[PDB]
Amino acid sequence: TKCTLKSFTVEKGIYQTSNFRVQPTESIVRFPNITNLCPFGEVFNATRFASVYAWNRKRISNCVADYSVLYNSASFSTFKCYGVSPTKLNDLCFTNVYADSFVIRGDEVRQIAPGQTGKIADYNYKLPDDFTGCVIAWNSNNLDSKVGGNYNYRYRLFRKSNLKPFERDISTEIYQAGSKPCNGVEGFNCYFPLQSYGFQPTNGVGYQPYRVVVLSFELLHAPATVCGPKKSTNLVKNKCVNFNFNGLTGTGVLTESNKKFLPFQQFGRDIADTTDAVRDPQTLEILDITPCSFGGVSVITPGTNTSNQVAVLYQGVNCTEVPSTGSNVFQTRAGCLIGAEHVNNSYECDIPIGAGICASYQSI
Amino acid sequence: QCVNLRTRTQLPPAYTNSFTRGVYYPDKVFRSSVLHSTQDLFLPFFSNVTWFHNPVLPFNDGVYFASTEKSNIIRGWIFGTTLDSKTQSLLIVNNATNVVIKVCEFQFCNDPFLDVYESGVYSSANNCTFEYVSQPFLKNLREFVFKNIDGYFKIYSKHTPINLVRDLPQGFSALEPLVDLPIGINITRFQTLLALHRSAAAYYVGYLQPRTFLLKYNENGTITDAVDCALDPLSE
Numbered sequence: 314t315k316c317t318l319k320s321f322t323v324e325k326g327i328y329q330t331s332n333f334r335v336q337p338t339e340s341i342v343r344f345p346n347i348t349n350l351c352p353f354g355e356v357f358n359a360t361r362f363a364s365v366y367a368w369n370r371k372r373i374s375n376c377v378a379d380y381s382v383l384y385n386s387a388s389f390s391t392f393k394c395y396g397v398s399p400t401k402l403n404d405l406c407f408t409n410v411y412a413d414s415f416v417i418r419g420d421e422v423r424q425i426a427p428g429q430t431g432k433i434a435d436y437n438y439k440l441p442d443d444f445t446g447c448v449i450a451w452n453s454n455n456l457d458s459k460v461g462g463n464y465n466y467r468y469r470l471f472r473k474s475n476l477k478p479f480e481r482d483i484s485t486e487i488y489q490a491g492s493k494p495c496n497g498v499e500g501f502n503c504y505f506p507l508q509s510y511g512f513q514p515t516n517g518v519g520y521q522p523y524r525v526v527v528l529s530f531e532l533l534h535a536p537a538t539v540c541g542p543k544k545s546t547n548l549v550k551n552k553c554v555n556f557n558f559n560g561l562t563g564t565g566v567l568t569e570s571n572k573k574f575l576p577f578q579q580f581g582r583d584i585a586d587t588t589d590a591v592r593d594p595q596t597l598e599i600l601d602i603t604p605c606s607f608g609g610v611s612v613i614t615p616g617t618n619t620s621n622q623v624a625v626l627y628q629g630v631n632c633t634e635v636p637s638t639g640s641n642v643f644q645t646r647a648g649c650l651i652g653a654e655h656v657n658n659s660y661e662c663d664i665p666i667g668a669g670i671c672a673s674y675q676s677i
Numbered sequence: 678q679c680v681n682l683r684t685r686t687q688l689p690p691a692y693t694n695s696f697t698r699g700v701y702y703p704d705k706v707f708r709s710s711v712l713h714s715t716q717d718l719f720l721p722f723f724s725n726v727t728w729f730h731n732p733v734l735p736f737n738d739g740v741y742f743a744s745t746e747k748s749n750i751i752r753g754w755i756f757g758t759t760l761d762s763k764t765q766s767l768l769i770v771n772n773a774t775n776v777v778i779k780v781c782e783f784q785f786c787n788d789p790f791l792d793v794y795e796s797g798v799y800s801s802a803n804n805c806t807f808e809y810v811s812q813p814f815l816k817n818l819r820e821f822v823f824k825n826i827d828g829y830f831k832i833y834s835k836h837t838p839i840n841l842v843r844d845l846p847q848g849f850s851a852l853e854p855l856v857d858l859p860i861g862i863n864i865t866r867f868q869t870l871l872a873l874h875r876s877a878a879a880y881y882v883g884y885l886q887p888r889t890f891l892l893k894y895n896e897n898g899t900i901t902d903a904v905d906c907a908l909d910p911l912s913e
């Protein structure tokens with residue numbers, strides 16, 4: 314009171330000093346039950362993977378993909394995310410995903426990277442330097458390699474030109490090394506571009522088969538459809554908390570409501586565009602939002618001359634959240650009042666309070 | 678499998694008064710016993726809409742489609758710009774079991790229709806992007822509103838048991854939202870699909886324009902009345 318009044322003495326009366334508001338306690342988030350998980354089981358755990366020059370292409374769109382489970386998987390020898398960080402891939406996402414799956418030797422895994430050239434990197438598959446996405450590779454000696462000779466796997470060895478980024482070549486034309494034409498039969502200057510692999514269970518490290526899948530994320534102006542889930546949590550009631558219900562943020566206390574939403578609305582507002590009720594995405598029930606209480610504070614004093622004991626009034630605040638004990642606490646139509654006694658007599662009004670009641674000094 | 682017929686499907690292109698039909702919920706916000714003014718695309722009151730008793734018609738901003746359907750002859754819709762594989766084509770069919778929605782570069786014939794003894798009106802189906810299957814949409818009146826904004830296709834629908842003879846009845850009924858599509862296409866024309874057996878089809882078409890409307894919400898949150906503000910001075 315002395316601070317606001319800027320004096321060392323205070324005249325008898327009632328003064329307004331400051332405000333008071335209930336602080337939020339914790340935060341909660343709500344999100345639907347999730348659905349349409351992305352099918353990585355039939356891609357990464359596929360029984361058969363095609364050749365390097367004929368890599369299998371898979372389109373991923375309109376599903377939800379959890380990157381944490383594959384990030385924590387230790388069954389993959391190499392997991393390199395170049396365009397984006399692997400941890401934040403669950404949040405950021407693109408409009409579609411393209412998966413290129415194939416099998417190569419262990420020594421050829423380094424060629425599958427931006428800014429890399431080689432036999433595989435130029436004759437079978439080419440990766441652009443501006444590529445964004447991830448590459449996941451793991452050994453498949455126990456599966457792809459064959460005791461009798463894994464000749465089913467082939468790699469392109471001969472071509473006049475290189476490969477375009479994200480270009481697949483399946484032509485089996487007899488390459489002509491020299492200037493001597495060949496009538497479909499390989500000769501001195503003609504050889505088969507495709508060479509069969511020689512994978513065996515025991516063939517040395519580096520020569521063993523390795524399954525490599527490259528995921529490229531594209532963000533064409535079409536809406537994004539595939540990325541990580543939103544982690545929901547439980548809800549509380551009768552507590553001033555902040556919330557982000559399905560992207561709609563607000564602070565207040567949440568109670569049960571009897572309003573009957575029609576089966577397709579999500580939230581309601583009464584007038585002047587203020588949200589009142591929301592529908593939780595999981596339980597599908599209508600709640601009610603009320604801003605948690607606030608109001609001004611005031612001090613009643615009998616004057617510095619007479620004494621120096623005061624009373625405190627909180628305006629329009631229920632006598633439930635005062636903080637703190639002081640003296641007996643009175644609840645009045647004007648708010649709550651601490652530090653004064655209530656009597657059944659009736660005198661004249663000295664320091665008006667409100668709602669037909671006021672206080673004086675005798676104690677106060 | 679698709680060949681042209683002998684007789685032309687010359688349906689009489691007459692005109693009929695729109696009265697007060699073609700009002701839908703503009704959002705998903707609940708409001709109780711309140712009057713709200715909103716500016717959006719709508720079908721102006723008492724307009725003259727086209728009546729057919731199967732050419733290619735422009736899409737424009739939006740389309741209001743109505744069918745006084747008996748025994749479910751109307752089956753689907755086709756949307757696109759070039760109506761071939763050179764541009765994305767949207768196909769919707771409600772067959773006997775479920776609705777199928779496709780977004781592919783099809784190759785349609787001159788006069789596609791469903792045919793009975795599935796889909797053979799397209800000679801090719803390549804580069805498919807979006808597929809969808811859901812519950813079927815369908816002496817009844819079937820009303821639909823088709824809109825396309827910033828790569829989003831909105832379909833609203835309403836079914837009504839009607840007993841009037843010829844034209845749209847004098848009554849009010851809001852259109853609830855039905856389906857949304859997060860696909861980006863620039864459709865400019867469309868078509869109607871009939872399952873005509875190898876051996877008298879009437880519907881109503883109207884267009885949409887931007888304007889302001891006033892809507893009334895009752896206590897339960899249902900739209901019960903509306904007023905067009907770009908009309909006679911009393912309404913304004």
Ligand SMILES: *[C@@H]1O[C@H](CO)[C@@H](O[C@@H]2O[C@H](CO)[C@@H](O)[C@H](O)[C@H]2NC(C)=O)[C@H](O)[C@H]1NC(C)=O
Binds near residue numbers: 346597
């Ligand atoms: C979201 O998932 C929860 C979890 O299953 C669903 O809650 C279930 O609702 C049924 C319906 O009575 C109960 O029998 C189960 O006991 C509930 N599971 C619980 C409480 O863990 C909820 O219905 C789902 N919401 C949807 C699908 O909209």
Ligand SMILES: *[C@@H]1O[C@H](CO)[C@@H](O[C@@H]2O[C@H](CO)[C@@H](O)[C@H](O)[C@H]2NC(C)=O)[C@H](O)[C@H]1NC(C)=O
Binds near residue numbers: 632633
């Ligand atoms: C301050 O809050 C308390 C607690 O919510 C209110 O007490 C409730 O009042 C209602 C209305 O009569 C009763 O139905 C409840 O049974 C009461 N609960 C308890 C625990 O007593 C109190 O009414 C509020 N103050 C004012 C002025 O309304």
Ligand SMILES: *[C@@H]1O[C@H](CO)[C@@H](O[C@@H]2O[C@H](CO)[C@@H](O)[C@H](O)[C@H]2NC(C)=O)[C@H](O)[C@H]1NC(C)=O
Binds near residue numbers: 772773775777795
């Ligand atoms: C109506 O269309 C649905 C949707 O395509 C058909 O249901 C599918 O039919 C195919 C071929 O019979 C099956 O391979 C799918 O498994 C079916 N899907 C579902 C969800 O049932 C249905 O057969 C069509 N009916 C008619 C009469 O044409």
Ligand SMILES: *[C@@H]1O[C@H](CO)[C@@H](O[C@@H]2O[C@H](CO)[C@@H](O)[C@H](O)[C@H]2NC(C)=O)[C@H](O)[C@H]1NC(C)=O
Binds near residue numbers: 531762
């Ligand atoms: C056939 O599909 C391919 C991709 O599956 C389309 O290629 C896209 O073409 C657009 C045109 O500018 C590019 O912006 C995209 O980057 C391309 N790749 C995508 C979307 O992955 C091709 O356009 C399709 N063919 C037709 C006729 O639409």
Ligand SMILES: *[C@@H]1O[C@H](CO)[C@@H](O[C@@H]2O[C@H](CO)[C@@H](O)[C@H](O)[C@H]2NC(C)=O)[C@H](O)[C@H]1NC(C)=O
Binds near residue numbers: 895896
């Ligand atoms: C709004 O909702 C209320 C509550 O459901 C409806 O009131 C019901 O009306 C039916 C038939 O008119 C009665 O059989 C019920 O007993 C009523 N229930 C209650 C709680 O009143 C009301 O009809 C709905 N429509 C309007 C315009 O109020």
Ligand SMILES: *[C@@H]1O[C@H](CO)[C@@H](O)[C@H](O)[C@H]1NC(C)=O
Binds near residue numbers: 353355357358386
């Ligand atoms: C492949 O199968 C193993 C064994 O069940 C599993 O741990 C792994 O998550 C699966 N990977 C994918 C991509 O489904």
Ligand SMILES: *[C@@H]1O[C@H](CO)[C@@H](O)[C@H](O)[C@H]1NC(C)=O
Binds near residue numbers: 617618
């Ligand atoms: C209070 O006021 C009286 C005059 O009414 C004065 O005599 C007295 O000294 C004052 N006491 C103080 C200022 O403490």
Ligand SMILES: *[C@@H]1O[C@H](CO)[C@@H](O)[C@H](O)[C@H]1NC(C)=O
Binds near residue numbers: 655656657
């Ligand atoms: C009188 O005051 C006392 C305490 O001051 C209170 O308990 C009581 O309810 C009041 N009224 C009557 C009729 O005693």
Ligand SMILES: *[C@@H]1O[C@H](CO)[C@@H](O)[C@H](O)[C@H]1NC(C)=O
Binds near residue numbers: 692694723724725
């Ligand atoms: C019918 O439509 C025509 C448009 O060609 C219009 O000029 C005419 O006024 C309409 N008739 C009405 C509204 O009664």
Ligand SMILES: *[C@@H]1O[C@H](CO)[C@@H](O)[C@H](O)[C@H]1NC(C)=O
Binds near residue numbers: 862
């Ligand atoms: C549709 O064509 C218009 C023609 O200018 C173009 O601006 C627009 O980007 C196209 N949209 C799609 C989705 O093809």
